[PDB]
């Protein structure tokens, strides 16, 4: 059922049955004041009905104003609800492919995972623990970084799937080959690591102190272009549908949402900068390294890290140090080429520059697959 609105858009009314103390199997995140259906979990009523979609904004549920609520309030609320739930939604503008037959993939884990030790887990309640040798039934890989799975030997009636890390096949030894950086085709320098470790600062210090060499990939946005902005260099200003289409078409390295608009750095954006003879400078979330490495961009990833816990206390609010060091225990993937321990910006910058400069004269080891 759909209802047109005077000022806003057309809303969507769906009805899903809810059992007392039994979750629907859908997760919600806050984007500004809005409540957004962010994920549909397999095995719940929400999934079976096929009435809720990722990206659907929840305006009302059974006469209750949902918009404006913290997701913690929405969580407490629906936990105390049952019976027929009438949803009033602003239907998702995302583009999911036509329904494929549920394809299960059975894997064996060669690593231990405890979601309570994971800072990155999107919905902690859904975290699924497993040990080396456990067999996982991966029901959904729609989210490359978070697979929905059941663990074989899970004695409790689940009934919902769990979330597990979507790691690529990391071998014990990965075959490597030397790659010389061409004179006119610089490798994109890409920075990763915790937030407040001066990463954004080191970028701008490079972009400014050596303006002639470095450049930035022109990102895309759904935000309407402003007065003193140019449609070429500031952003590629596109409609939301175009952005959503590009997302589905795997055209984005990384994309996020800011103030009810989408922003993202396209693969072509970087490939264009490479072709200019300039060094593309780009900060990414560790999560987005998967999409990045799978393209022929030949990136050089530098990990930017804070010092030890004790040395962090010397330089120093309290909730920040806990967050950094927690992210540092998870750096074991080691997709990066080199790490920089930022204690002093000036000391970190010179080391950063020295690393970037060295690419001109000295060849580097890349996965052999990049050259073949």
């Amino acid at each position: 059922e759909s209802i047109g609105q005077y000022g806003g858009e057309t809303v969507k009314i769906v009805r899903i049955e809810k059992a007392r103390d039994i979750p629907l199997g859908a997760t919600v995140r806050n984007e500004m004041d809005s409540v957004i259906i962010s994920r549909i979990v397999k095995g719940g009523a929400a999934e079976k009905s096929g009435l809720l979609h990722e990206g659907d904004e929840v305006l009302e549920i059974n006469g209750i104003e949902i918009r404006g609520k913290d997701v913690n309030e929405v969580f407490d609320l629906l936990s105390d609800m049952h019976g027929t739930l009438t949803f009033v939604l602003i239907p998702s503008q995302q583009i999911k492919p036509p329904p494929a037959k549920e394809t299960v993939i059975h894997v064996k884990a060669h690593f231990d995972y405890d979601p309570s030790d994971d800072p990155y887990v999107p919905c902690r309640e859904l975290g699924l623990s497993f040990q080396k040798g456990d067999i996982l039934h991966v029901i959904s890989q729609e989210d490359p970084n978070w697979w929905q799975a059941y663990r074989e030997g899970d004695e409790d009636n689940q009934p919902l799937a769990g979330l597990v890390p979507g790691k690529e096949e990391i071998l014990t030894y990965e075959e490597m080959s030397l790659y010389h950086q061409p004179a006119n085709r610089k490798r994109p320098i890409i920075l990763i690591g915790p937030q407040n470790c001066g990463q954004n600062e080191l970028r701008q210090r490079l972009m400014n102190k050596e303006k002639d060499r470095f450049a930035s990939a022109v990102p895309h946005t759904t935000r309407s272009r402003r007065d003193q902005e140019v449609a070429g260099r500031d952003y590629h200003f596109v409609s939301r549908q175009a952005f959503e289409a590009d997302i589905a078409a795997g055209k984005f390295i990384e994309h996020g949402e800011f103030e009810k608009n989408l922003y993202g750095t396209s693969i072509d954006s970087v490939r264009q900068v490479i072709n200019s003879g300039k060094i593309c400078l780009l900060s990414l979330r560790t999560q987005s390294l998967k999409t990045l490495r799978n393209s022929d961009l030949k990136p050089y990833i530098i990990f930017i890290a804070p010092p030890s816990q004790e040395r962090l206390r010397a330089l120093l609010e309290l909730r920040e140090i806990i967050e950094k060091t927690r992210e540092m225990e998870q750096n074991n993937g080691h997709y990066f080429d080199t790490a920089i321990v930022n204690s002093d910006l000036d000391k970190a910058y010179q080391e950063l520059l020295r690393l970037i400069n060295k690419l001109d004269t000295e060849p580097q080891w890349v996965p052999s697959t990049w050259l073949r």
Binding site: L24, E31, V71
Partner: peptide
């Protein structure tokens, strides 16, 4: 610098099960 692009670098909103 682009103010918006520095924001999207921050960790995504936490989810919660309904």
């Amino acid at each position: 610098p682009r103010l918006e692009m520095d924001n999207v670098l921050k960790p995504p909103p936490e989810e919660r099960l309904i």
